[PDB]
């Protein structure tokens, strides 16, 4: 169910991504709410696209993890923590990570173009 | 380790958004409202604050807008601010109704601008100001009155507030939740339950009851400038009536502009009133007192007293019963000192209503034909507080506190589906 | 076999959506309307139902909303509901115009609230009610009349209904299509043709003609409570005139509030009328009769008769000609029994118009200076039905049936681009 | 032309998918119609994305065809039937198929993540 | 070579779109306006045209809509179009104020329809028309006047026009840019600077100044039917005052309808005026003359003269100062021939204002209590032009030219992110 | 910065595509502007999708360059010209190129389906 995994560990909740994904998308209030829901959906889809993740729910990248963002190991993060706690611990680094992701995907596209010209 | 992007993460943040109506003529426009699963979050603890909940402010704006919208096509009653020549309706009454009804003569407009008509109408004394004897309506020096359309019902219809996609409403299921702080049992819904927009002061009617025990809620329980909302575990039944049989008459005041007024009374003239069982009220107060002692001291004397003053709309229990507006004197309910069969509340009827504590707008409520009786549940109280003795008095008039008593368990949150976490997976 | 997903599939389902206007002052706001390919579906058969077509309901709501919008900035004419002192305009007439025009004296308001003016106006007898002789306007006991702005034309302008992206309009090209059932020749358009919002009763004017043969359309041809819409193969020309030369006068009734009224008549006073050729009408009825025999029996006697009763708006042929509202007596057209040079219809003129069968709103149509003549095409009929003899009578008044006569060939469908089908292709 | 293939067989109509795809995307009526057109477009694109078909018109999957949905062979479906008739015969199974597609793509992404961690 | 698609290309085309407000009661609704980086384009040359700039048309529509919106809840003043019985306020004055103020007696409505009150009010002679002596207000034969709400300020507040996503605003930074043609130094912003909606004629107040030199801008400098906008390098200070101490009175004219009017004058009655330094004005004109010689000839005689005629709103310098509307006579400023300490401008005050050159709407400006003084900067001029001598005169009245003087440096462009170019890269 | 590369050469400006891409996405004016911004964004994304470029900023295709569209060499186009000048020179061929791109991607999807059936 929608947000049913909110209290579950990060690992277990990673198998319900389609459940929340499907739920992301008087007359004037309904119209304004519909328009703002569309803008939020598209903003998140644009961020996924520019990182090279346009069609994926789980997307692996080429940006290394910096231990200053979080120095926890993978068993602590995936077996003990939930996603709400994780978002709270590293919320202050969200914009740093996004910028790095943006740079890496753009660089990768350059190399792809460079290789297809040979 | 590598950065991995996850989309569809069950994470959220506090947010303020626009909510829409769902429901199953009527002043709340439930036909424009759209037609109407609770998922338990097993290990989610969520911090709530009923005093900073923007669902109350949105409900307030929505109720006022719907109220005002229902009056736009109705008769303006501009011709009614004229000098009235009034006498007492029943000079032989020696009951509490002596002087309450005025028989007022006036020159009213007609369908043709060059013709006038002489009209005799009955008015309640609370609707007129003395200038036979000369009178004017109470609204004539502050606002114009619009006649409510006789075809538009004032009966509360449950309204469900539904959130748009990308947002969710979290509900607190903790039976002892006091409106603020951590809630260990939280579930997600997209639409709240149906909340009836019941408008009243001092006594909260036809609302939700507490589960196991009475619940005292206050923004700051030690600040005497804040109101105390009391949610009862069991209802107290209140039987209200307008026992007289009122005959309604109608005249034309313009092309298609009909004026409805109180014509006569068939039979005896009697005072409107509400009946509360004495034993039920006393048990209810004993329960309120134990819960107040938990905050004010086990050895503190707890006193109840009548409202200290202000407009009739806040010094009485104001409510709409059968289309009429009742102002009941609750001094018989709040008159006790707590140290360590029927109760009858007299009620006044008014036809000129100043809603939502506004100045500049007023409504004329046309009379209801016949005898009115209604039975309601008292589900909560609004109290104010003034050593070794504490005194509590009825409060109210700000309708947001009536809606805070139903929306206290709901919070609106924004879903944040993008998460980033370290993994061993590298892009190839 | 494997599931393969196809996006862009040419599939659709019945749907009801919002349509928008396209066009090439004017009461229908064609300047807010946006500026204006038919693709044949070679093997598509589509089931149509003109009686459940939501394009008619949307067109109805749109025409009423545009009509009402054009009257918001116009003079309210509140001062006109006064006692009138009326006499006969031309006491020496012995024609059908005797008593039709009243010369009414009244005290009208001026630009200054403390000053009045005496006004003499001509009114048609159908616009006044007797209380010289005392009269009032017919609207004074039901509604206020708003003066139509003299600068706003009432001439129908074609309106194209265009569908939004994701939707399409299917058009039925079968020349014998009766409005319901399977259509073997269907094409897709996004915008219908330009449909003129012609408002009339009994006779459908300036519409579409049938191709090969006259077409009888009815929701239930055996239910006498339903109307029969008749689409003609050829038009019948109708020449309507208001032969008198009317002089229009104007007075000021407030700051910037001008009242336009019928001042005088230059020359002779004559009755308004419409001319229909007798031979053309008789051939038209013979064609209608053969098509009715196809449904009611080859040996049934088919009778035409005048409307049995009701308001003038439905017992006559109502139409707007040159800005004036004509009510023509069609009893000369529907008076025949079918077993096994000019025709002249008298017409009345009205200035107080109650549109769309509503009560509570009324319009005052200011007079048109001079002599009015218009020529229209009769493209269809609205008939009602009451053994061995069947009797048909003129009907109308519900404008949706006038629009059903143009929208009968269009259907709105939603495109469903996602399809799933088995293939031999497996994802790798 | 738009919907020109509606009367054609399923095979022939499969080569006009771009024709209908390009056509999927008073003032208040126009505004509400524009907003609803956008929501329908995005809802269909979201369904394609969650199935792993975000960039394709013809998308092959790993969900087997169940003969209880349709027991017709491929020549009957592709050479004789049109897409309108096909949608009508199997409309009752549309939601079953979509659920299976949602599960398979999510499982595939898990395996991709599992393989990139080695 | 192969076609390669690039998304995010820094390319744009000319476009017309809807702009929104950003800001940091008030007639311009800056509370509905949202809360408020300039990137230099090093090698971008952009062609501008201030005379075809749709930002001016949008600003015009927005300012008019905001102005009209601020008057919807205010008193309608319908009862004021009555006969007035007027005399001269101060029969002993021999100054320019003789006959300027009328002491007018009238019968006004009250809170009760059956009661009247006798009112004495002071009016400026420009607000009344002679029919003691009988007068009416100037608006009574053209429009109704709405009283401005005393709580709504008329003080210009800077408005920033921000463009939506997908669009950008290009700013021209060339100090000698004349409003048209190529601009070699262009930067991109998303929101313009704050432009105050200052309403004035002839003299542009509180605007932007030129950088290095005075700038003459005209759609066609040789077409005498076009206006010449002059942007000054330095401001000319103008000190305007309403030196009399006016006492404001108020009466009730209906339920909740208060009428504010000019009651009395405390002390001496003196003429309103504006002071301009003679030396500063003369230097300013010398600068304007050199720049005009650059277009009209070095040996041409340049003459300045007073406005040739028309309504007071265009023949004088019209502006709002402290809530009052001033009409200052500028004939002392434009009276010179150019071949090869204080200046005092008399001003009239008006209370009935016809804004935006419209007919049918009018506003009543309630009086301001006390003495008014304001100091403004003259930042530009609006000139018109009529051999060897050229004559220039004050112009204005079309507020778009006041806004063209601030929006001349901005252009709205649409971003076209999809580009196609040849490369050596082939898809595999 | 947004449009900072507008005056730069086509090559240099090709490395700032994410800068403009992120910037592509009273109450009634704001609502109408938001809806129209969304429609323009989605129209461009739809064109990228139908060409097989749904997730890329730089997308190479199988449509050959026709010398009648531009007979300039690559050093003239990429080292001397800016994107504004290029769009101006070949604006008249934009719709020709788009049609060819639409046909090639559709043909490629057919072949993919044809190969996965073996
Ligand atoms: C509380 O609820 C009761 C029951 O719904 C309301 O009383 C009913 O009011 C309607 C409308 O006048 C009557 O038709 C019913 O007969 C009433 N019920 C009974 C048992 O008498 C009551 O009015 C509500 N209270 C408030 C304040 O709205
Ligand atoms: C049917 O169409 C005819 C022709 O368009 C209409 O008659 C015209 O009406 C306009 C407006 O008054 C006149 O300027 C034309 O001169 C008229 N034409 C002729 C030939 O006289 C006619 O009014 C329409 N009928 C209806 C009911 O709208
Ligand atoms: C030009 O700007 C000046 C300064 O902002 C305005 O003068 C001020 O007006 C307000 C409102 O009446 C006063 O409270 C200030 O005291 C004034 N300033 C001074 C120095 O007197 C002036 O009104 C503006 N001009 C126009 C035409 O709007
Ligand atoms: C809640 O926590 C318990 C462990 O205390 C765990 O077994 C359970 O699965 C969790 N619930 C969810 C929904 O993850
Ligand atoms: C009605 O008006 C008349 C004057 O025409 C007055 O004498 C009478 O007293 C009025 N009646 C009332 C009830 O005010
Ligand atoms: C509500 O509970 C919180 C603890 O969660 C406490 O701090 C607060 O004082 C309580 N208030 C009332 C009125 O019970
Ligand atoms: C609650 O009220 C008391 C008394 O007014 C005050 O001292 C205290 O600070 C208040 N608490 C908060 C959280 O505002
Ligand atoms: C209240 O009780 C009294 C008896 O004390 C009874 O006469 C009256 O009718 C009751 N009214 C209601 C509304 O129950
Ligand atoms: C009220 O009076 C009406 C007559 O107008 C009568 O029919 C009705 O029964 C009366 N009701 C009561 C409760 O007395
Ligand atoms: C009001 O007074 C008049 C005059 O005395 C009387 O005729 C009328 O009946 C009275 N109204 C009622 C309801 O008794
Ligand atoms: C009062 O509460 C009881 C439940 O205790 C409920 O059954 C009854 O219907 C309520 N009465 C009203 C009028 O809501
Ligand atoms: C107008 O009013 C006067 C009274 O002032 C009356 O005598 C006259 O008959 C009225 N005229 C009409 C036409 O009603
Ligand atoms: C219309 O045609 C259908 C057959 O398609 C028939 O059943 C129906 O009765 C017909 N109705 C009329 C009025 O011709
Ligand atoms: C048509 O009308 C007849 C007579 O009223 C009725 O018997 C028949 O059932 C109707 N048909 C439909 C489809 O409603
Ligand atoms: C109708 O015909 C008559 C002759 O019978 C003629 O006098 C009249 O003018 C005609 N009117 C029109 C409108 O054709
Ligand atoms: C109608 O009368 C006017 C004079 O008011 C005249 O100019 C015009 O020609 C007349 N028209 C006809 C048809 O008689
Ligand atoms: C109406 O009657 C008056 C008085 O008899 C007369 O002066 C006037 O001319 C008449 N109106 C017309 C149009 O003849
Ligand atoms: C009447 O129909 C004919 C076609 O038969 C057309 O040419 C003519 O213009 C139509 N007349 C009107 C007034 O629409
Ligand atoms: C319609 O069917 C025929 C076969 O009867 C076929 O040849 C033709 O191509 C079909 N039309 C379309 C558009 O597919
Ligand atoms: C007010 O009205 C009276 C008549 O009742 C009139 O005599 C007087 O002159 C009027 N006063 C003014 C100032 O018009
Ligand atoms: C503005 O400059 C252009 C050249 O860019 C010139 O053609 C035009 O005449 C100038 N106009 C004025 C009024 O300076
Ligand atoms: C400018 O005005 C002159 C004189 O009116 C005219 O000859 C010239 O063509 C105009 N130029 C333009 C570009 O309109
Ligand atoms: C204006 O008059 C008021 C008294 O009404 C006084 O308080 C104020 O100081 C005066 N102002 C001037 C500038 O004279
Ligand atoms: C206007 O005139 C009246 C009568 O002469 C006088 O009483 C009043 O004071 C005058 N108004 C002023 C402001 O002096
Ligand atoms: C006039 O311009 C100067 C700059 O030269 C500025 O400092 C001053 O504030 C301006 N005055 C007004 C009233 O805007
Ligand atoms: C502008 O052009 C110069 C060459 O003249 C170049 O060096 C500079 O980088 C260019 N600026 C940008 C932003 O590309």
Residue numbers in the entry:
A (entry chain E), D (entry chain B), F (entry chain F): 521 to 545, 571 to 663
B (entry chain C), C (entry chain A), E (entry chain D): 34 to 57, 66 to 77, 82 to 141, 150 to 184, 188 to 309, 312 to 323, 323A, 324 to 397, ...
Paper passage:
The N332-GT5 molecule was designed to engage antibodies containing a specific HCDR3 motif (derived from BG18) but bearing diverse VH and VL gene segments. N332-GT5 was designed to induce diverse human BG18-class type I precursors. We conclude that N332-GT5 consistently induced BG18-like type I B cell responses in RMs.
We employed cryo-electron microscopy (cryo-EM) to determine whether N332-GT5-induced BG18 type I BCRs engaged the N332-GT5 trimer with a BG18-like binding mode as predicted by the sequence analysis. We determined structures of three BG18 type I Fabs, each containing distinct genetic features, in complex with the N332-GT5 trimer, and we also determined the structure of the unliganded trimer for comparison.
